[PDB]
From Swiss-Prot:
Its EC number is 3.4.23.22. One of its GO terms (molecular function) is aspartic-type endopeptidase activity. The chain holds residues 90 to 419 of 419 of the full protein. It comes from Cryphonectria parasitica (Chestnut blight fungus). Disulfide bonds join 255-290. Belongs to the peptidase A1 family. It catalyses: Hydrolysis of proteins with specificity similar to that of pepsin A, prefers hydrophobic residues at P1 and P1', but does not cleave 14-Ala-|-Leu-15 in the B chain of insulin or Z-Glu-Tyr. Clots milk. This is Endothiapepsin.
Length: 330
């Protein structure tokens, strides 16, 4: 089997992407944030505290003939950005782009933090990291990908995120028309539960490539590119007037600037992030100070190849017995 679904930016800045997902019988379609940095599939639901729902589409398990309470199971998650959610668990039929999993754990939110309530466009998350990170207790549950894997033509999914435009998540096949050149594959460590890999270096604009190992994660659920302070300082030093602002919470730059590109290494290959991808607009409405899309990972504890980086590439998440990651230009 295979699946193919379009993923769409939630706003003009590409802050996140939503992909329609069919849950239950008859289908209830919810727009979920596919997150390769977490491993829970959770939804706003009929069980969510009413004051914490503001415009989201909810899953109502009582209206699904295939929903079954997973007795005694609870979940609770806290994300890197400080947001959180928790609740109970059903199993139900879940389909993405024509690919169907029966008996998928669908984690029903009883509580969500303010940032989720405040974002009316995201109806929940669909985790695509390794199932060892799944938070369901007392019986940990598998991701959608893990459940689908054996049925897929090939045990892979791909992320093809757009810049200010829709893109695609494919399951079970590699669309050879979706990228240019060849795909370069690189080793993954699953020891922390993430799609963790090591970039071979970077360049700023038309500058020379610096060979240096950068260990990080491929995370579709994180907006920006978070790299070591040394790398980030080298980037922003090429932008007149750019500075790190403790009050804003990272590097800002004059909105009048033209940003240089940023290149990262994948083995001997190179992915170029155009400068415009690094512009996240005014810090507040009407400001001429703009927020940068490359930020320091210092004190996160890990480097994060988030959407800013991933949307510059066609990315293969290879879930073979020994997982790997592939990157191509596009």
């Amino acid at each position: 089997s295979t699946g193919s679904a379009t993923t769409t930016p939630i706003d003009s800045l590409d802050d996140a992407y939503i992909t329609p997902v069919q849950i239950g019988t008859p289908a209830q379609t919810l727009n979920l944030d596919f997150d390769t940095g977490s491993s829970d599939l959770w939804v706003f639901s009929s069980e969510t505290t009413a004051s914490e729902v503001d415009g989201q589409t909810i899953y109502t398990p009582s209206k699904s003939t295939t929903a079954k309470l997973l007795s005694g199971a609870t979940w609770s998650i806290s994300y890197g950005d400080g947001s959180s959610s928790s609740g109970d668990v059903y199993t139900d039929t879940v389909s993405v782009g024509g690919l169907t999993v029966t008996g998928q754990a669908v984690e029903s939110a009883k509580k969500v933090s303010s940032s989720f309530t405040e974002d009316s466009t995201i109806d929940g998350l669909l985790g695509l990291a390794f199932s060892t990170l799944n938070t369901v207790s007392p019986t940990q549950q598998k991701t959608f990908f893990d459940n689908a894997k054996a049925s897929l033509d090939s045990p892979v999914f791909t992320a093809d995120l757009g810049y200010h435009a829709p893109g695609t998540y494919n399951f079970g096949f590699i669309d050879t028309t979706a990228y240019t050149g060849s795909i370069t594959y690189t080793a993954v460590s699953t020891k922390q539960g993430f799609w963790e890999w090591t970039s071979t270096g970077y360049a700023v604009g038309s500058g020379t490539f610096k060979s240096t190992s950068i260990d990080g994660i491929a995370d579709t659920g994180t907006t920006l590119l978070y790299l070591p302070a040394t790398v980030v300082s080298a980037y922003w030093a090429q932008v007149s007037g750019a500075k790190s602002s403790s009050s804003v919470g990272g590097y800002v730059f004059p909105c009048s600037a033209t940003l240089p590109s940023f290149t990262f290494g994948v083995g001997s290959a190179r992915i170029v992030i155009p400068g415009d991808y690094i512009d996240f607009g005014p810090i507040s409405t009407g400001s001429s100070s703009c927020f940068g899309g490359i930020q320091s990972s210092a004190g996160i504890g890990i480097n994060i190849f988030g959407d800013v980086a991933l949307k510059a590439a066609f990315v293969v998440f290879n879930g073979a017995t020994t997982p790997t990651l592939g990157f191509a230009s596009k």
